[PDB]
């Protein structure tokens, strides 16, 4: 271990020394190694340190100078692995050691997840047995063919077949092992380690209790190491020791998400002095994870950093809150498996990976959506280990049988948004431990009094459709869906989120409660069909509230025509946001091409020739991308783009909106300059035959939803139906 190059904040546990020892001896004797162990067993770190420690002649130590040079050839082992991949890796190292010094240069293979493809459907690890004896198969054994092998696995491995190697089957890290690793990780600074040495043993005891508590392997060693590094960094930055809030924050951050685990209670029981009696919520934990400090990552190298975050949710709600009250200043890119018709998955994941790489190099946050298709191309970047060079971090990103190092900026954060069920039953535990878990589904952000706002608004909008009238001889009960188009028994939560975000101040003064309730009412009625707002005179609300809400619906809010809405929108400024994104739901027919021409005709002052986009033709994502690129490229200011989406038709353009929306915003975030405003409007045509109730709710966050009855202006009828309520048909024909 001492001969190997040093690394600060590395623990001298029996684990790490044992793996690097067995590794250096086996690849010297060319003996297969089958290092297994639970996540956090330092097998991969052992592989990296062995690779960078056994260079032949330029070795830092004289003992590694007298030893051979090693050139491994990595090969990630996804469960969808083929024996051709390992055969190719073996042939590659056979060429590598061909013609070089056998006694000073040796090339080996590493299958970082070999245990994963033990039950792959394509029988991948079934020709490895002859391979690890005579170098290659279906050919003569020969020199420059014998190759080492380190079958690293994070899962229990079949011993019968792989007996020919050396099974270093790491056991469960014992309490003494955990305290030793605890001492070794904080070795970077001698001074604070002697201040924080006491907490180490109870930490290990509590960690073993929690790991043996749940049968599921939801928590592991990586979380413990992150916890100890986090407390190390907090103490060293604070320089005065530890306050209990820091310890509880650390354990909460690195231990959370699991439903049946009060890990805070478990840790604080063994640490009665480290109690906290105040409430700390998930929102500030996310804010700390995603926004590290200016004093953070400000000294030499990056040894102490947070993990990438994995929010656990349900009903795909995380994005709304995250885009409401966290993603401030700079909006992170959103990556997803685009749902546009006839897009090949391989090209899409390649493009997503390229965008990920661009974001990492630049240093702009990434928010993922699908991991069950790009987990094998990220866990190395989610390993958070860096191959330093020139003082710059570099990580491994892999595409198929091709792994390549790539730059990572020092200001870069990653968020994976997944639901509770999918992670708890489909997510691999190594990914779980590589990712800092956190649950923020729908209620965590929501204060209890905000839940009361939700229920009061629920009962307020449940009787908004409750109208009993004999103006017609008919009995048809109105659902709250039809009065407020989109409402889906959940839109109250999203709308109150929007309301509190709009208020911003976010305190309790008994005035903010009233005003957030009233703004929530305004946002509800802003998506209300005009017929409902005029029936509201006789509905169970009353007949003064009816007048007031009709006034707000026809005077303050703009709902006559799309063009009037655009004028009112572009006239006013915003919350310093370079762009404002609005969703429009309509019953009239979608614009047909001369309408946008006249639309610009009375928008000759502000708009920049808005372009309409039909979503039935974009049988590829890149058609939409190139259209958006062209619209951003054309000169002007305060440009406007409109996307039509007829939900009532034979087409499938119903869920595709989702993909399109992200794409558009993504394009702006990566294709808009720094000197032009942008307004994106998404328009959809709905019917009154029930398709106006089966439409999803108020997609919150970065979409201001609103409802326009008819897009086209009306010169014939007046633009204010309250006067038409006042007057009769006779009064419409009076002479001057």
């Amino acid at each position: 271990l001492r001969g190997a190059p040093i690394r600060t904040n590395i623990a001298r546990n029996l684990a790490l020394k044992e793996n690097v020892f067995m590794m250096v001896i086996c690849i010297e004797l060319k003996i297969p190694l089958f290092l297994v162990g639970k996540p956090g067993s330092s097998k991969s770190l052992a592989k990296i340190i062995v690779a960078d420690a056994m260079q032949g002649q330029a070795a830092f130590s004289e003992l590694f100078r007298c030893l051979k040079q090693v050139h491994l050839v990595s090969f990630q082992c996804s469960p969808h692995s083929t024996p051709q991949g390992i055969i190719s890796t073996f042939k590659q190292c056979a060429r590598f050691q061909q013609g070089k010094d056998l006694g000073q240069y040796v090339s080996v293979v590493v299958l970082d997840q070999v245990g994963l493809a033990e039950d792959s459907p394509k029988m991948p690890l079934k020709t490895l047995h002859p391979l690890l004896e005579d170098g290659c198969i279906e050919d003569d054994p020969a020199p420059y063919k014998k190759v080492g092998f380190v079958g690293i696995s994070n899962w229990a491995l079949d011993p019968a077949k792989m007996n020919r190697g050396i099974f270093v089957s790491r056991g469960s890290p014992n309490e003494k092992e955990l305290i030793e690793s605890a001492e070794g990780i904080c070795s970077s600074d001698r001074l604070v380690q002697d201040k924080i040495r006491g907490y180490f043993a109870p930490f290990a005891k509590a960690y073993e209790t929690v790991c043996q508590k749940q049968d599921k392997e939801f928590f592991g060693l990586r979380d413990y190491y992150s916890l100890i590094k986090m407390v190390f960094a907090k103490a060293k930055a604070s320089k005065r020791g530890l306050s209990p809030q820091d310890i509880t924050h650390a354990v909460l951050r690195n231990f959370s998400g699991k439903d049946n685990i009060q890990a805070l209670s478990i840790f604080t029981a063994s640490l009665p002095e480290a109690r906290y009696k105040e409430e700390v919520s998930t929102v500030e934990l996310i804010k700390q994870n995603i926004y590290p400090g200016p004093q953070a990552s400000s000294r030499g190298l990056d040894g102490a950093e947070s993990r990438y975050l994995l929010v656990l949710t349900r009903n795909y709600v995380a994005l709304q809150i995250l885009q409401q009250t966290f993603f401030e200043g700079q909006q992170p890119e959103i990556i997803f498996g685009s749902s546009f018709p006839q897009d090949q998955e391989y090209t899409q994941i390649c493009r997503n990976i390229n965008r990920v790489k661009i974001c990492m190099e630049t240093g702009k946050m990434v928010v993922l959506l699908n991991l069950q298709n790009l987990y094998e191309s990220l866990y190395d970047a989610l390993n958070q280990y860096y191959v330093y060079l020139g003082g710059q971090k570099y990580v491994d990103l892999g595409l198929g049988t091709h792994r390549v190092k790539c730059r990572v900026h020092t200001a870069f954060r990653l968020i994976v948004i997944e639901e509770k069920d999918v992670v708890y039953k489909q997510f691999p535990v190594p990914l779980i431990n590589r990712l800092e878990k956190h649950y923020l589904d729908m209620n965590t952000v929501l204060q209890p009094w905000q839940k009361s706002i939700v229920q009061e608004l629920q009962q307020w909008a449940h009787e908004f459709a409750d109208v009993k009238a004999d103006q017609f001889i008919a009995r048809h009960k109105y659902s709250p869906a039809d009065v407020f188009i989109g409402y889906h028994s959940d839109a109250c939560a999203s709308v109150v989120l929007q309301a509190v975000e709009r208020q911003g101040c976010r305190d309790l003064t008994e005035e903010l409660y009233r005003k957030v309730s009233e703004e929530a009412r305004s946002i509800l009625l802003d998506c209300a069909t005009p017929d409902a707002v005029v029936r509201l005179s006789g509905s169970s609300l009353g007949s003064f509230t009816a007048k007031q809400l009709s006034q707000e619906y026809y005077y303050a809010q703009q709902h006559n025509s799309f063009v009037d809405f655009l004028q009112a929108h572009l006239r006013m400024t915003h919350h310093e946001c370079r762009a404002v994104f609005t969703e429009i739901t309509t019953f009239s027919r979608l614009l047909t091409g001369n309408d946008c021409d006249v639309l610009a005709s009375e928008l000759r002052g502000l708009a920049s020739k808005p372009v309409v986009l039909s979503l039935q033709q974009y049988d590829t994502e890149y058609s939409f991308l190139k259209d958006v690129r062209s619209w951003l490229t054309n000169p002007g200011k305060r440009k406007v783009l409109v996307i039509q989406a007829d939900f009532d038709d034979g087409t499938r353009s119903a869920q595709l909106v989702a993909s399109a929306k992200y794409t558009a915003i993504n394009e702006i975030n990566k294709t808009q300059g720094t000197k032009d405003f942008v307004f994106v409007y998404f328009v959809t045509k709905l019917s009154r035959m029930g398709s106006g109730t089966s439409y999803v709710g108020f997609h919150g966050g970065l979409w201001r939803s609103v409802h326009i009855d008819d897009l086209r202006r009306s010169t014939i009828m007046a633009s204010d139906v309250t006067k038409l309520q006042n007057v009769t048909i006779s009064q419409l024909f009076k002479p001057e």
Partner: protein
């Protein structure tokens, strides 16, 4: 409602109200006390703590109680339930409040009252009218002593556990007393008088408590933990108790700490401890200030002139030592740099480095010596260390580069030579910045310059180091690349273009080609697209996987931050995606069965203005080509291709709905049949597969069917289309119109495009004609208790389903046995098309016979296949059918939970028909009898049955010997027999029929092997899950399947034999069996 809203938030509702109206104020108080209650999903408490917490935290309950107790004319009229609740609240308060006069109070409620002192004092003064001060102060003092001793225990436990690796100490009873939570009665603390208070922490003696007090006084003192650890090493395993640790381990530590104390107090310390115990305070003193202040905490003595001058000595010694280190490293880099020069002030410095001194005072003569090296840096000498140990690097630079100007071109020579990867392209820049920074001492250095110039150069290097603190690491990782730095200047022709350069090349002159290769290999998407990159005249071909990994490589290029590179790479990626997608739609069409794209081929010129070049494998239609940008042309071509695919699936569904017999074969068998039937002398594969409709089809009957199917009216129509089409092609200027019209005419009139095949209409007519010549149609009535107009669902049982079906079909004695039609033996992952074909065969009007159509093992179909099958069945019953069909579905009795058994619950016949085993046996054995005058291989068998299953309880008996002796008995008669004996050893588990089919293929596709061939299948004992389906498919149904290829038909005259060793036991008895014994 409004007060419920207001108290739902944490605001105050009533604070200064002038509300002398008594009844109405009582009503609003009832509202607040029924709506400010701690609701927890609907009146759950069953406890008193939460009520007390709400009592002590709410700013309106104390005002409410005040107002209700001021006058007696308000409480009387509030509400029955509200008065009940406030009576409960007052009772709860009285219960928790009579408790504080005693020790029965709980600690949690006690801290709760201490954190709401004002609320609690007001409510207690309120309840007094129906001591407070002294009782509460005494109680809080008792709590303070409680927490003091608890923290003493905590710190002692933590310190004794920090050395837990050396020694174990049993903590009397505290190890369990301290373990439990703080939810116990205060009376357990036993605050006694006559004074001392012995609590639940049974401290052995107050000496342990005062030791704990001192230890907590130096719990954080780093020096104290070092002393305690080194004195704990003196014991070493040992299970030792608390009382003897005080003098075994604590007393020596405290004594050493006390003596070292008076040693620093005297200022007589020596340098040995200075560099022995103060070695971790390098360049950090403020926390050392506080640590040394913690040092003076233990002794109740002042600190006025003790830490300041002593920490000054510490910092001056540290500065001295770092100055020695800097001086030695600067001399080292000097002597390695080759400069003689002169400093003439560091010789006394190194002489002192070779000196040893013992005193803790101020070196006074060394002030001037260290003046030149006071504040160089604590960092930044590592850069010079690296410079010193990298002699090879600087020697190579001064043997290769030697100047600053040519570097500007040198890195350029590197940039082309460097690889495409991010590491490869960043190597050049890191080396460039390293040499740019280090030219301060590497280029401005003469063999003789004085001290002042050296220091000025060091200063300008310092100001070159302020913006990039990684410069030494850049030097390190550039020096580690010395071989590349050597080979870049002597670079030969690097023959590897790039990932991005080859992107530009393939974009410049790429030729994508789709061929549907005429060679024998499959039609997989990998082998249907190739790429041509021409040049000279060399032309490199590219496969799909090579292109995909190319996409990976150029997708992981570094950051060039230019429009050209990213635009061209994404253009190449986009054209590749569209090309793959056209391949996707084309292969979907090919697997649908087209005959128009079998000889299709397409060249796509990735070059700008390169267009497309279509081609069809017929002489009567000329080539089709376009021009223009490739991306929107390809988008249009793909849209049109998908629309044509939809129209083609529609037209094949419609045409299959008209001819029944053309619903027999799968789509690829349709294309093969259409190809083959035009041959004058068709091969034996299609003859065999026609023997499943006509039966024993021959050339004469097939030519009769293909000659009496067409009329000269069809020929006139084809001549009309031929004379009409080319001007229609020339009518539309661009290719899109002529493409649309050629594909439309293909849909309407196909057979003229390829006068070497048959369209769907001609095929259906031919099959119908073969049906007409092949008479004696097959009739099969239903069993008793089975309805004849609706699905007949049966849930038999996994070991009875197959005999159930074989008994259902028994009710037609002397009727020809069923074949792959009307009897579908389902397996997991069965193609949907086969069940669609079965449903069609059972619901078409043209059948010239009533037959029972059975779907065995229905639950074994997958979920999605079952869903599609049920959707198709409902649709086909919706459009039209014949309402006399016999449909039987069989499922497994224990597998009712799957899709198709669950969806036929209403259509259930809970009858489960079956027949006695001898009846099924007689049925099968009699129906296997080969009639005389056929010259069959069954003549040697037990009088002509052509099927035998050979089994035995244990192996090694001679079953194979029986097979071979039967073969040689046949050889004995009918001399010159040359009878083949095929052997197939089905051996893998999860048995596959395709292997045995393929092994059987080359044997009757020749017609010169029509002679009796005694086949002999054999099996291995690792086939556990695949015996019955295959046995019944081959021996009973007489067919062998493949989703996309020819069909093998068991024939009446080729003897078959299946060995099987010893669930299945009942099954083997069905067939005419032979068994052997030791």
């Amino acid at each position: 409602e409004a007060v419920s809203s207001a108290c739902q938030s944490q605001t105050s509702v009533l604070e200064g109200l002038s509300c002398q109206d008594l009844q109405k104020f009582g009503t609003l108080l009832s509202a607040v006390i029924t709506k400010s209650w701690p609701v927890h999903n609907g009146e759950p408490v069953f406890d008193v703590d939460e009520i007390f917490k709400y009592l002590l935290k709410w700013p309106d309950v104390r005002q409410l109680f005040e107002l209700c107790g001021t006058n007696e004319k308000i409480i009387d009229n509030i509400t029955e339930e509200g008065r009940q609740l406030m009576a409960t609240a007052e009772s709860v308060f009285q219960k928790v409040a009579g408790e504080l006069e005693n020790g029965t109070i709980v600690v949690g409620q006690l801290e709760l009252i201490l954190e709401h002192q004002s609320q609690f004092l007001d409510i207690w003064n309120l309840n007094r009218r129906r001591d407070v001060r002294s009782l509460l102060k005494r109680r809080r003092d008792d709590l303070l002593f409680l927490k003091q001793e608890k923290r003493y225990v905590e710190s002692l436990l933590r310190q004794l556990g920090r050395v837990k690796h050396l020694v174990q100490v049993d903590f009397g009873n505290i190890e369990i007393i301290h373990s439990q939570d703080l939810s116990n009665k205060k009376l357990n603390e036993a605050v006694i008088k006559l004074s001392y208070k012995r609590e639940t922490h049974y401290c052995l003696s107050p000496d342990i408590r005062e030791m704990a007090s001192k230890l907590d006084s130096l719990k954080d003192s780093h020096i104290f933990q070092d002393f305690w650890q080194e004195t704990a090493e003196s014991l070493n395993e040992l299970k030792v108790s608390l009382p003897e640790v005080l003098e075994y381990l604590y007393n020596p530590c405290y004594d050493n700490f006390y003596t070292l104390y008076e040693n620093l107090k005297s200022g007589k310390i020596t340098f040995a401890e200075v560099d022995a115990i103060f070695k971790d305070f390098v360049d950090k003193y403020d926390e050392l200030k506080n640590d040394l202040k913690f040092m003076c905490t233990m002794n109740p003595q002042d600190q006025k002139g003790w830490i300041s001058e002593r920490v000054g000595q510490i910092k001056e010694y540290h500065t001295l030592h770092q100055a020695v280190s800097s001086a030695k490293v600067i001399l080292q880099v000097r002597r390695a740099l080759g400069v003689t020069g002169d400093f003439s002030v560091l010789n006394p410095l190194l002489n002192f480095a070779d000196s040893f001194e013992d005193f803790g005072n101020e070196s006074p003569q060394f002030i001037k010596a260290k003046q030149l090296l006071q504040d160089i840096s604590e960092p930044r000498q590592r850069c010079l260390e690296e410079l010193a140990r990298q002699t090879e690097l600087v020697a190579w630079l001064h043997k290769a580069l030697e100047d600053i100007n040519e570097l500007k071109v040198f890195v350029d020579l590197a940039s082309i030579s460097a690889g495409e990867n991010d590491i490869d392209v960043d190597r050049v820049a890191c080396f460039h910045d390293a040499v740019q920074g280090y030219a301060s001492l590497l280029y401005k250095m003469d063999e003789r310059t004085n001290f002042s110039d050296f220091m000025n150069h060091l200063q300008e290097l310092w100001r070159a180091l302020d913006n990039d603190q990684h410069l030494p690491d850049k030097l390190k990782d550039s020096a580690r690349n010395l071989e590349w730095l050597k080979t870049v200047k002597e670079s030969h022709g690097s023959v590897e273009l790039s990932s991005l350069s080859l992107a530009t090349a393939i974009n410049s002159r790429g030729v994508y080609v789709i061929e549907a290769p005429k060679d024998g290999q499959k039609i997989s998407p990998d082998t249907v697209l190739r790429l041509l990159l021409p040049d000279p005249e060399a032309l490199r071909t590219y496969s799909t996987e090579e292109l995909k990994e190319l996409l990976n490589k150029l997708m992981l290029m570094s950051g060039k931050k230019d429009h050209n590179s990213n635009t061209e790479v994404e253009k190449f990626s986009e054209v590749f995606s569209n090309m793959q997608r056209l391949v996707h739609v084309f292969i979907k069409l090919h697997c649908a069965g087209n005959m128009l794209f079998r000889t299709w081929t397409a060249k796509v010129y990735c070059c700008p203005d390169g267009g497309i070049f279509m081609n069809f494998g017929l002489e009567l239609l000329s080539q089709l080509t376009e021009k223009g940008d490739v991306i929107q042309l390809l988008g249009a071509l793909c849209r049109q291709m998908e629309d044509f695919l939809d129209n083609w699936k529609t037209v094949v569904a419609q045409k299959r709905a008209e001819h029944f017999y053309l619903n027999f074969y799968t789509a690829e068998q349709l294309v093969y049949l259409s190809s083959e039937l035009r041959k004058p002398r068709p091969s034996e594969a299609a003859l065999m597969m026609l023997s499943f409709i006509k039966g024993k089809c021959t050339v004469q009957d097939l030519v009769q069917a293909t000659s009496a199917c067409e009329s000269k009216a069809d020929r006139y129509c084809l001549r009309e289309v031929m004379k009409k089409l080319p001007q229609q092609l020339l009518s539309e200027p661009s290719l899109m119109g002529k493409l649309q019209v050629i594909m439309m005419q293909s849909l309407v009139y196909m057979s003229a495009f390829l006068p070497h095949c048959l369209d769907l209409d001609a095929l259906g007519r031919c099959l119908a004609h073969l049906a007409t010549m092949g008479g004696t149609p097959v009739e099969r009535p239903l069993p008793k208790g089975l309805q004849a107009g609706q699905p007949n669902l049966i849930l038999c049982g996994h070991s009875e389903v197959l005999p159930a079906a074989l008994a259902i079909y028994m009710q037609a004695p002397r009727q020809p046995l069923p074949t792959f039609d009307e009897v579908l033996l389902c397996t997991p992952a069965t193609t949907i098309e086969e069940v669609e074909l079965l449903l069609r065969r059972c619901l078409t009007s043209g059948s010239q016979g009533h037959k029972v159509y059975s779907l065995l093992f229905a639950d074994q179909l997958s979920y999605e296949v079952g869903c599609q099958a049920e959707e198709f069945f409902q649709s086909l019953c919706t459009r039209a059918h014949r309402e006399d069909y016999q449909l039987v579905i069989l499922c497994d009795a224990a597998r009712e939970h799957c899709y198709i058994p669950s969806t036929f619950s209403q259509y259930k016949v809970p009858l489960v028909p079956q027949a006695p085993l001898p009846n099924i046996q007689a049925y099968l054995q009699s129906h296997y009898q080969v009639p005389k005058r056929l010259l069959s291989a069954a003549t040697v068998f037990r009088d002509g049955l052509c099927v035998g299953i050979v089994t035995s309880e244990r192996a090694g008996v001679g079953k194979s010997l029986y097979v071979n002796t039967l073969h040689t008995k046949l050889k004995a008669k009918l001399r010159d027999e040359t009878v083949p004996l095929k052997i197939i050893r089905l051996t893998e588990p999860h048995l596959d029929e395709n292997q045995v089919l393929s092994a059987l293929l080359p044997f009757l596709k020749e017609k010169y092997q029509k002679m009796p061939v005694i086949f002999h299948i054999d099996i291995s004992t690792s086939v556990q899950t695949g015996i019955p389906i295959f046995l019944f498919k081959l021996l009973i149904l007489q067919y062998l399947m493949d989703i996309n290829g020819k069909i093998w038909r068991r024939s009446p005259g080729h003897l078959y034999l299946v060995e099987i060793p010893q669930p299945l036991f009942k099954f083997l008895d069905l067939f005419p069996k032979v068994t052997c014994r030791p």
